[PDB]
Structures are given as C-alpha cells and as structure tokens.
Design a binder for these strands. Structure first.
Ligand SMILES: [Mg+2]
Ligand SMILES: [Mg+2]
Ligand SMILES: [Mg+2]
Ligand SMILES: [Mg+2]
Ligand SMILES: [Mg+2]
Ligand SMILES: [Mg+2]
Lengths: 159, 169, 294, 72
RNA sequence: UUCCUCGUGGCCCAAUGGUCACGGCGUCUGGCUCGAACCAGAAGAUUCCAGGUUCAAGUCCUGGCGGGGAAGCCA
RNA sequence: GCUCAUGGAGAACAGAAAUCUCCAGUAGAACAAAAGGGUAAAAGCCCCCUUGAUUUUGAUUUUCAGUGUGAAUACAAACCA
RNA sequence: CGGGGUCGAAAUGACCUUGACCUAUUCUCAAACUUUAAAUAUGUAAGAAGUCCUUGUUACUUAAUUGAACGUGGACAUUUGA
RNA sequence: GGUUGCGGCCAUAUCUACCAGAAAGCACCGUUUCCCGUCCGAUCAACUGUAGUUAAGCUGGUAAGAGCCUGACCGAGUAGUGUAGUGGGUGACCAUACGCGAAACUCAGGUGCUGCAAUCU
C-alpha cells in the first residue's frame, strides 16, 4: 500500500542535529516578532506542537499575526499554474528572523547617510550597487618574481 | 595532608532476604525493629524466576539503614560474633565492606519465641567528610581521587580500629 | 585502567549547557519563567530570585535579555545590620526582612512607594497586594526559587511573604507557609506571626536555657555577648521593619580601595599560562633527560 | 608471483593489470621512506603488520615503546 | 510453484499462554503361578530446527526442513 | 522527586539470575503497538491531586478540485484541574 | 570465573592447548548506517504600499504615554537604491 | 584581576591524571526545639555562623595528553557534478571543451569569551 502522511519523508529533515539534541536555548523565546517581519521556517523535531508541514521547511514568509506562544506566517505556495497564499500558525521554535532584511535595512540607512552627506556639496552620490566589473589595467613586475617555467609531468602509478 | 580526610561510617545496612512473604517476613521485620529502633522497609522482587519461588512485587526482603553511633554499636556487636576476623574478599574496591551472620540470637534478640531464627547481611559504607557533594541537588559534583575511599585505606582503618586482623590476601 | 573513556565516547558526547553542569540552573523552569506572551512584545517578565547560601540570603529582581539577564534591585542579608539585625542572617525572619527591603527599594526607585504602602501592621494574614482604583496596577513579579524544594515552612516563602507585605504583587497561595494545617486546609495566623519575629528561635532559646546551658553557650553566643534575650527578639525585628520602610535606598560600602588596587595583588598571585616556545622547550628537556639515558 | 597472477587473470572477466608497487609490501610507505624510518626506531613490528611512531601523543607511552628512536 | 494443515517419551494421540506436559500401548521391578493374562508400583521429554512477543511460552508471531492434502483451467 | 540499559567490585543461607551497597555509565534503556523521528534535574520510573478525553461555535495546515471526510495546528469567549 | 590435557590429593595451585572478552592495529562494504558533504535544482529580498522625525486613538498591553496597530503633520525624488 | 547570585553563546567550555590556591566569598562543616520529610535529620526542612577545614567541591595551571575549535597554494582543483559534441571505445566505460567543487588524510595554531548587580588586598 501507499503512504502519504503528515510527517512522511521527514526522517532526516526533522532530525535534530549532531551534538545539538535536548532543549533549546532561550534566545528563541526571547526574540521578538512583529507583524510584517520576514521569517524563515526550520522545524525543530523536539517540539512536536506547532510544527510546519515538511513543505514549508526552508521557506521564508511574512508575519501576519502574533499570539501567546505562536506566530502567524504567510507563505506563497505553487499549486499547478498559480500561487496560493498559505497561513501557518507556527510556534516560535520553528521560526527565526531572516538576516537578508537586516542586511537590506543597513544598506537603506547607509544610503540615506551618504545622500545627506553628499547633498551638502552636490557630488552625484550614485548610490546604486553595481555588479563586479571587469578588472582594469595593471603592471606586473618580475623583481624577485622571475617566471618559473613548468612542464607536464609523465605518467606514474603511485600505488 | 590529613586534617579532616578521616574515615567515618556513613551507614550500616542490615538485609534479610527471605524467599517468601507472610509471617516469616513480618517476624524478620520485627527483628530489625527491635535491633535498630527504626521501622524497617520491605523490598519487592524485580521479576519471577520460578526456581527460588518468587513473584514480581511479592515482598521478599526486608532491610534497614542505620547511621551514627548506633551503627558502630551494632557493628561492634557483629564483629564480636565474627571474632574480629574478616576475609580480604569482604572489602570492596570502593572502600566499603560487609559480612554475614547466622542466628541473630548471637546478640540482643535472645529468643522471643514468636520471632524465630534469621541471618543478616551486614554491609558498612565508608566515606570521608565532604561526601554530600555527590548527594546534594545544587552544584552536584564528584569527589576527588585523593579524597576517595579505597580498600587499602579502609583495611588499615579497620585494623587500627577494633584491633582486628584480616585473612588470606 | 578501568577509569578510561574512548575517543568515540568523548567525540559523540554532547555537553549540558554550562549551568546544568555547574548544577545551578533548571532550564526547564527558566523556559516557563522568562518566556513572555509574544503579544506583550518587549514587556519584561520580572523574577524575584531568592537564593540561600550559608551565611547569606540573596534577593534580586531580574529581567531577561538575549545578551544576559539584568537586575533592577538587589538586597542581601549582610546589610541588615544597618536596620538592626546582626544575628540570624539566614533565618525565616531575615528572609522576611530581605523581601520587605527589596520590595520597598524597587518601589522607591520606580515611584510606587507612597501608593502600595503594603502591610504595615503585620497580623499573619494571607492577603495579596491589591490594585487601587484610578491607580497604576501594582508591580508584578514571580518567584524563582531555583532548585530549592517547595516545602511547608521553607524560608524562601518568608521572602515571598515579605515582598508581598512590602507592596509587590507576588502571586501565591498560602499552603506553604508555616501554620498551615494539612487535615483542615486552612491557615493559622498566630504561628506565622511568631515565625516573622522569631518565636521559633526565642522559644528554643528559652527551652535551652532551662534544659541544657552548654548548648545555649556554644550557639546563641553572640546574643549573650551583646545582651540579647529571648523576649528582646520581637522588638528588634519590629524596629528593623520600620527602618527598612524609612530608608531602603541601598547605601553601599566605601570599598576601602580601587578595582586596580584589588586586582594588583590577585594578578601578582594568579598563575598564568605557559607559552608555546616554553612548552616546546619543556618537552625537549624531558626528551633529553628521561629518554637521553638520564 | 607475476606468473601466478597472470594465471589467475583467466578466471576473472574483464581486464586486469599486474602492477609492481613502489611501496614496502602491504605498507603505504615507499621503500626508501620505510628504510630510513627503520634505520631509526620509528618502526615496531607486530604479528604481521607494523606500528609507526608519531610526534603526537603522550611522551611516556612513545618512550615506553620505540626507545631505539630516542636512544640517539 | 501457490494455498491449507501437522510435527510432542520407543509407538498412536491430546492440551485454557498459567507447574521442566494428560492418556493408552511398549519397557523395567516386585508379586500370583513356569510363561502369558492379572495385582501393585517405577523410569523415560531439551514438545522438528533458527529467531522474537509477555512476569510466564508446548501453545502467541516469521523463515527453513520434512509428511500429507487441494489447485494447476479456456485455448 | 529520582535516573535508565549494561558492566565491574563486594555482602549468610544465596548459586548464572532473589535482596542490599558502591563506582562507572550521552542513553547503548523505557515512552501500548509497526517503523522512523524526538526526549535525561524529561516526554522515561515512583508518588500527590485530578477529569481540559468539558462548552460555544469560527479560522488555519495536510490529502486537495485548494470539495468532503479523517487527523492535526493556533486563537477567541466561558468553566475547570 | 568457558572447554581440554600434564605436575598433581586439592588449593583464591602451577605448566601448556583451544575458545570466547579487552587493548592497539589491519583488509573490505552498506537502497532501507553515518560524523562530514557537493554540483544541479529551490525559498525570500534588493524601497514611494519605502526610510526617518514629531505626537494623536484604543475597550488590547504595560509597573508606567510603556508598547502594538492604525493615523495627522514634516523631511528625503529620478542612480529611487543590482 | 579573584569570588558570589542571575545569565547569554553552549566542549576553545568536555574527559583522564597530577600540582597550587593571599584576601574575601562559595563550600564542607556543627545541632535537632520548632515548620517539614525520610527505613535512616544520608537527601529535604529548620537553627546556629558558634566548635574546625581548604581535605574535597569550586578556580587556575601543567600534559610532544584523548576530544573539540579554527586555518591552510596538505591532500586536491582530486573525487563527484551542470552543460556540449555525427568525440573514442564491441561494450563496460573513458577522455576533451565551457563551468562548480568536496570529505577523509597531512601540517600548524588554540583549549572558554562575555553581560547586569554585589563584594574583595
Ligand atoms: Mg538536518
Ligand atoms: Mg520545578
Ligand atoms: Mg511386569
Ligand atoms: Mg518532572
Ligand atoms: Mg480538511
Ligand atoms: Mg538562492
């Protein structure tokens, strides 16, 4: 017979870790989640209450509700030819802030600082990021760095 | 050096392992009651064997735990029976020791014919001061090696005390 | 030989955190205590941490953060001599006074001191600090006894009683105080009021002075040295309560010294690590000696 | 032995090559390396295989074994 | 090959998961009278093998072996 | 509140296995059952008190047509332990 | 402290044989073992529905004009955010 | 800088064996009338801080230590892998092109850092 249950194919995913079994540190419960916060989902196997379905492991969503012990997360799920929005009520042990948003907001305030700094003299900040450009010309010296000539080596067994 | 690493007797455990429950166990309990001044504790079986004749949780043994001067008193009263002679096997590698006696009428319990005849398995636990580091709830720790009890230490203690000797090896 | 652990064991071994190894913290309890309703977002949860050493009581008001817990107020027993208690610094009454002291202290520094005065005329009653109408809803704080046993007559609940009578709202039932009848599940205020002021100590002092005097001399010695009788014990605690309610504002010590003056001797004294070159030379010497035909 | 293995080849399917190894017997060391480790006392025979001295570990044990290496 | 069933003292056969196992025949000892029959009494068991389930397995669960049986049809 | 399997060393009858004592022991045990996850001052073992295995309907996740059933999740207003 | 032989009366007695157990090594493996661990595939984000400042509502929340949510007003425009 | 209470990260913190420990603090320690709990005041509770001791716990150091952590043009750009070809090869498989890129091993180094409050020659 076939078998498609809630925790089917979760053997290694809801495994806990190597040398990180037991209880969870208190920072998970002392973290603070407001509505609109972006959170990644990673299920802890030692907290069986408030778990996500295996589909939402490694999924990033937005908080829409906050309760005593849980947090309401919105996720986008591909169902055929479209996306549907999914509302999970997840305990916070299965929840951590995404660092991408923090790294974006640091750049936001840095760009604001640059703009305010360089508006005092009008020097065309050009705040946009840019890709890694091609490398410019340069000169390579042989002072103490004379070229060392190499050659292909023959075939040996090495056993 | 040697300020307070003296060997005192932590406790003395008297055990009587009857193969049955009922009146024999009650009488063995009444033995230890008059012997120790304490109320003994009956101890159950862990599983059936069908050869010795025991059911699981059938109240086969009775024991009692004594501490303080009463312990060394009863220990003197038992070493008198044992003639102040003990085998070296009877000393464990952790510093504790023990011996058995038959016919508890060797002391104290003269007959009182309602009770009868029984043996005992005396066991004496030795420790030094500072041993509650293992027993307490908070900041439970392990005793150091220099402070641990040993066979070579407790036999020397048992010889310089009671002026007794030890047999074969 | 027998005392040996394998490399596999020590490689697979997962350590308890640190305070579980040190045997000082039950994280299963700390979870339930410090975890706040997530809709009270940064609202702090305040613990009355009461701890008992030999020769000291420690009472702290503590909140939690991710970088470490934080103290509002702290109150110890070795500063009760300011208020008039030099003997019995670990007893039930000193616990009561420590709780009262930290209650009045934190209320004073928060501004909840003229309102929520607490219970001045002690009677041994069971009453919680109630909220006054058109009022600021008194300060709420929960016990953290730690690894100590919940037990009837235990003196952590004396600190609880004192903090309740001082003006803090400490949620509690009365079935762990002394004077609690088990057969008829109600409370007796008289025994509790005697415990507040030391009746369980004064009665023993009298019963010892009448029966065995060498014990009354070896212990209860300072009472003799400073002219304290059994009947003189209620009044000093009653006066200490008043002095606490008058000035609990934590006059600290003069410290006699500076942190650097204190650290100089300890650094001079403290053994220090051995460098890598020193280690290599220390090994080469042992090779040349123990292996170089001595 | 080359002929003994060349005869064994007929019993297998596929292609099997006969290689002379640069190591000392069933060891992972080359001939001169094993020789210059046995001239000193790094090496200690067992029933069939061999144990090697390491510059790691306690020194009491590495002297209890391999004393010929330290007796320089 | 599939499915069903059985495996027990020298032989035949039985058993409530609950005493190192009922009966009968055979064997042995003694008696009656020389032998049978008969009267009294004894002995004999790793319950086919290998695993597990329960405080307890002859029995409860899986595989193998051997004995027997049913099926193996339309062309 | 306590720590298990297992091993080692000891104690009359008592031996391989009865009961007692100590040391080690990251789980090598137990958690009704299948297997897999998870769990050590516990989710296990013992003890105390209990009926939240209650009421009212709603929302969400899985299977999925984003239907039903089943199961589960987090809340709300009560009443309780 | 398994099973055998020899000196043996036996011995918590010895010499030897064979097994198991222990220690350090050694050869080889795992769809339903694994400390570790890719490549390719996969989720989110990369701003005006944004950021910042000030102070208004609440029957929620707080020890508390403390927070939460929603707001008024004000500042930052085409390099407005790869 | 030491110590205590409460912690955060949770072995660079653990484990084995030794050594040392001013001051203070923690600790062992002393007693059983009361609250309280045990077969046992051993644990738990209460009283004293008095009669003593750093012996242990605790802290630190030591070890060509086990373990753990970090790094490396160490192995190895290897194994493996995305993409391509009317490439080779009877096939099994293998090379080449444009890319990504390990683990073990080897070597080297390290062996708790830190927050709030209080207290200490
Ligand atoms: Mg994983
Ligand atoms: Mg608790
Ligand atoms: Mg006959
Ligand atoms: Mg519990
Ligand atoms: Mg449904
Ligand atoms: Mg990505």
């Amino acid at each position: 017979g076939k078998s498609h249950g809630y925790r089917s194919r979760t053997r290694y995913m809801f495994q806990r870790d190597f040398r990180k079994h037991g209880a969870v540190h208190l920072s998970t419960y002392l973290k603070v989640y407001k509505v609109g916060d972006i959170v990644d989902i990673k299920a802890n196997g030692s907290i069986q209450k408030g778990m996500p379905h295996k589909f939402y492991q490694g999924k990033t969503g937005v908080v829409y509700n906050v309760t005593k012990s849980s947090v309401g997360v919105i996720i986008n799920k591909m169902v055929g030819n479209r996306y549907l929005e999914k509302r999970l009520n997840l305990r916070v042990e299965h929840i951590k802030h995404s660092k991408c948003r923090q790294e974006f907001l640091e750049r936001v305030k840095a760009n604001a600082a640059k703009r305010a700094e360089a508006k005092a003299q009008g020097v065309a900040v050009q705040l946009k990021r840019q890709p890694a450009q091609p490398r410019e010309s340069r000169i390579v010296s042989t002072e103490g760095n004379v070229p060392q000539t190499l050659a292909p080596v023959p075939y040996e067994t090495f056993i | 050096q040697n300020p307070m690493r003296d060997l005192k007797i932590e406790k003395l455990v008297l055990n009587i392992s009857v193969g049955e429950s009922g009146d024999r166990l009650t009488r063995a309990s009444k033995v230890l009651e008059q012997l120790s001044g304490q109320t003994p504790v009956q101890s159950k079986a862990r599983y059936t064997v069908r050869t010795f004749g025991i059911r699981r949780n059938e109240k086969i043994a009775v024991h009692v735990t004594v501490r303080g001067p009463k312990a060394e008193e009863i220990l003197e009263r038992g070493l008198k029976v044992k003639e102040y002679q003990l085998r070296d096997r009877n000393f464990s590698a952790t510093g504790n020791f023990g011996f058995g006696i038959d016919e508890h009428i060797d002391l104290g319990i003269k007959y009182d014919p309602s009770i009868g005849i029984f043996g005992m398995d005396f066991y004496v636990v030795m420790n030094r001061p500072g041993a509650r580091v293992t027993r307490r709830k908070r900041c439970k720790g392990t005793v150091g090696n220099s402070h641990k009890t040993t066979k070579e230490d407790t036999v020397s203690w048992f010889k310089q005390k009671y002026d007794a000797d030890v047999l074969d090896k | 030989q027998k005392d040996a652990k394998s490399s596999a064991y020590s490689s697979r071994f997962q350590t308890p955190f640190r305070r579980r190894r040190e045997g000082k913290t039950d994280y299963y309890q700390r979870k339930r205590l410090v975890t706040q309703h997530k809709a009270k977002y940064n609202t702090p949860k305040y613990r009355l941490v009461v701890r008992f050493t030999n020769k000291d009581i420690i009472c702290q008001i503590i909140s939690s953060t991710i970088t470490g817990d934080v103290v509002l107020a702290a109150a110890y027993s070795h500063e009760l001599p300011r208020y008039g208690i030099t003997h019995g610094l670990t007893n039930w009454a000193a616990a009561y006074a420590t709780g009262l002291l930290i209650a009045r202290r934190t209320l004073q520094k928060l501004g909840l001191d003229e309102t929520y005065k607490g219970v001045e005329e002690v009677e041994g009653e069971y009453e919680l600090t109630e909220a006054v109408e058109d009022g600021p809803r008194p300060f709420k704080v929960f016990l953290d006894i730690g690894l100590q046993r919940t037990t009837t007559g235990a003196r952590v609940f004396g600190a609880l009683k004192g903090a309740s009578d001082g003006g803090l709202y400490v949620p509690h039932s009365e079935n762990r105080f002394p004077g609690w009848d088990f057969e008829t599940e109600e409370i007796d205020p008289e025994l509790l009021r005697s415990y507040i002021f030391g009746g369980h100590v004064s009665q023993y002092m009298e019963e010892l002075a009448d029966d065995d005097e060498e014990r009354f001399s070896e212990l209860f010695k300072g009472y003799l040295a400073d002219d304290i009788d059994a009947d003189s014990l209620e009044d000093i605690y009653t006066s200490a309560h008043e002095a606490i309610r008058a000035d609990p504002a934590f006059k600290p010590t003069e410290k006699k010294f500076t942190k650097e003056q204190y650290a100089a001797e300890s650094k001079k004294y403290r053994q220090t690590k051995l460098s890598k070159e020193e280690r290599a030379a220390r090994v080469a010497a042992k090779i040349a000696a123990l292996a170089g035909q001595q | 032995v080359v002929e003994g293995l060349r005869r064994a080849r007929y019993k297998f399917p596929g292609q099997q090559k006969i290689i002379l190894s640069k190591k000392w017997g069933f060891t992972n060391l080359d001939r001169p390396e094993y020789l210059k480790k046995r001239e000193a006392g790094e090496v200690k025979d067992d029933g069939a295989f061999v144990k090697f001295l390491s510059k790691k570990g306690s020194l009491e044990n590495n002297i209890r074994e391999f004393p010929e290496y330290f007796a320089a």
